[PDB]
Amino acid sequence: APLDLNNIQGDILGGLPKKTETYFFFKITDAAAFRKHLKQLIPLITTTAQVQKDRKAIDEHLPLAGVNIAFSHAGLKKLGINDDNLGDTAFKAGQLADAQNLGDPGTGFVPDWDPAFKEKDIHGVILVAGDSHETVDKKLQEIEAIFGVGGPHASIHEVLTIQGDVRPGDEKGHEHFGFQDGISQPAVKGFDTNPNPGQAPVRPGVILVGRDGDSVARPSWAKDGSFLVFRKLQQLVPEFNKFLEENPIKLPGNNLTPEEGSELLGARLVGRWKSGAPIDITPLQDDPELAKDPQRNNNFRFDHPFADEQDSQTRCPFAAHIRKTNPRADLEDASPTSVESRRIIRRGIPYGPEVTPEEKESKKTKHDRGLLFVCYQSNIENGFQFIQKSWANNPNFPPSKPNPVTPGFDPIIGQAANNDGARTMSGTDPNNQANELSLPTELFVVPRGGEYFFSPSISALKDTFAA
Template sequence: MASSTAPPLDLNNVQGDSLIGLPKKTQTYVFFQIDDNVKGFRTQLAQLVPLITSAAQVQSHRASIAQNKKTAADKGVPPPLLKLAGVNIAFSHSGLAKLGITDEIGDTAFDGGMLADAQDLGDQGTTSGGTFTPNWIPAFKNPVHGVILISGDSHVTTAATLLEIEKIFAVGTSNATLHEVLRLVGDVRPGDEKGHEHFGFLDGISQPAVQGVDTSPNPGQETVSQGIILLGREGDTVTRPSWALDGSLIALRYLFQLVPEFDTFLKQNPIPGLPPIQGSELLGARFVGRWKSGAPIDITPTQDNPALGADPSRNNDFRYAFPDDPQTQDRCPFAAHTRKTNPRADLEDLSPPISTETRRIIRRGIQFGPEVSAVEAATGKTVQGRGLIFVAYQSNIVNGFQFIQHSWANNTGFPIDKPVTPGFDPIIGQATDPSSRTLSGTNPNAQSNTLALPTQWVVPKGGEYFFSPSIPALKSTLVLAASS
């Protein structure tokens, strides 16, 4: 529950990735376990705190990047990369328990951990002796106590920052207090694919604006209360321990994408009535809800419009109710990824309207893995792993990520009250039998026809729920003063 005595939000207190987003060309995630010398860990943690990048610092980093771009544009030269690093840290429930913090944050998904949630999220796995084990990589099937996020303009910058952090925790010496269990490195895709996820679609376009922080929202961009993202702020409906104020909960998913298989499916199933290449492009756009450029199909349903895709003043200005009817799939299938995960008029225009404010999340993922090779493209088979390190911030995982994945994307009847069954979100919807997925509305001229999706092209291989504490909480609750 929002504390009525909480002081006004100060961006110096909030870790920078949640509200503003660490700028990144590359990001390293170091997943760690805390060793038995917990006191030693908490003492060393004090030295990490000055390296943590606050939301206020991220704002100033972003201002420097914008200025750098402008200066270069004025000179007619390409902007030189600014050397900038960012560091954030977050802890899982088992990590907080290891630190002896027993005050519960008050989120059942976080408390149980993502491994215990995997079956409900629809991840594939096996059940033996009544216990479900997802098909995840081993590191995520064992306790992960925390994650350090290091972002930067280059691998050289992130490697130098990581070295500094390893020194703090005496890694490689007998005084080490943590050990790394997994390192993931994500990179923005090269060239024109910058900002696009591996299936080729521009990502990170639609984010909620946060009250008092994003003060000039773009047309169509919804403003949410601070407590939708930050614990203890107005709009957070759960009673939290006081030290949780201004923290945020993270859902991190290690999602592999079967890109050649996805591309082959689009090629083999073009929307009828168009030249094959256009028919395939339209099918992809109707799966996502946007063209590869980011242009929303609800605004431009028959052809891509890259200028619209790139224009923040127009690319979120739609509601799935053109001109005033959310009951058709003329422009966008009910089950398209963006419509499933943020249904706009589908719920807002019901009587009575259903607010989606508590379902909003801020996404900060990054791509991992190489570009598709010529051999993979020719054979339609993935050889090298690639995908998305999905990172979503919210104050309440049960209302946010967990609900979106379980009750929207995987729920064939969502959005509710439609004339035909929407089906699965073709991008992230998960079924017990992954080859049984279908959706309706892919063909605008035969909207009740269903299309069978033989493959689940996004494959979860792990993840965890984390708590990103405020900087004051790090100092007062997590860190132990050297003299204690």
């Protein structure tokens, strides 16, 4: 059947438009009151239908708020909602239980997370996205009132609030390392009806529980919901920059300046120039015109050369972040159902202040900043967990490579098996692809915690969650 976009929470398909976004992580302290309160929240919940209207209004221009809600397994238990058939071990077990296997640093095993993610019983998260702090703060006061926060009717307790902010000026839509984000998303069949060149279509059930392509009995209340993975990922920006500065690529002829060598290395760690121009299309120079053109900036698959050819890392290293997280032709030899199953929708936002002169000049992080990583999928095991653990953390992925090649770790998110995280990456020098680059002992991205949630449908919120 066609998708009913007025039944789907709007961060999942379309995504909540934003300059700032607050995540309000809560514990349910009064289940009966919470279910009554939730009836009054439902009219505030932004559906995909409303997002499409909102995006049409932004594209023609604005005070605009979007609201979604998601529940952890601990929250469903608290509400007495039987989730025996919801998701699989990952959602039921919670992210803290998965931290060791994700490769998160520990003093184990307990991960080195922020206390709120490590110590505390998170039952859910309310997402509030808006054009401004004023818009989000106003909407949060309304949502707090609905749940009685600050008064004797309270049904929830705040565990943690985290604010994200899109970066300023010409860095708008770039993450803190300086790279354009939000380019490549799967095209959901029945929603993204005009995929860009290179944008692979996926059956809706890769994203939405209970739809075509959802390879898992389901409870009726899970249809048209999606699993929300949250990770707070701290970024060490001066430390990343220091690594590029110390490791410029020198191509035959020694024509590149050290600055150009360091810039090229950055592009080859991610798979794109900071502009968003993909290196599989423009391997040795940026192309700002290409970077801005959605008909062109995703039209590659790592097929010329293909993975199995000698010296096949000429244009993009195997271990470049995007080639680890979306292998394209490195696996597209396998079934359309198999490769579509690994796709995620990303809806994160940067957090924290811009790098200060002192941080920049001293080359040392003083302030907490990074990515509030959010992704949606119908199956956490097939999406987020597989990408992190089978691909990013696997130095010998992909098997389509030549046998003598050891790609190494995703240099952005890749984590090694023991606290001794010695990480290497091959292929960064296109004319000496066997040469290993030792990554620093100190990670560039430091996980600070997160949780696995479920964003229900509107009808599920009305007919199952609310009272």
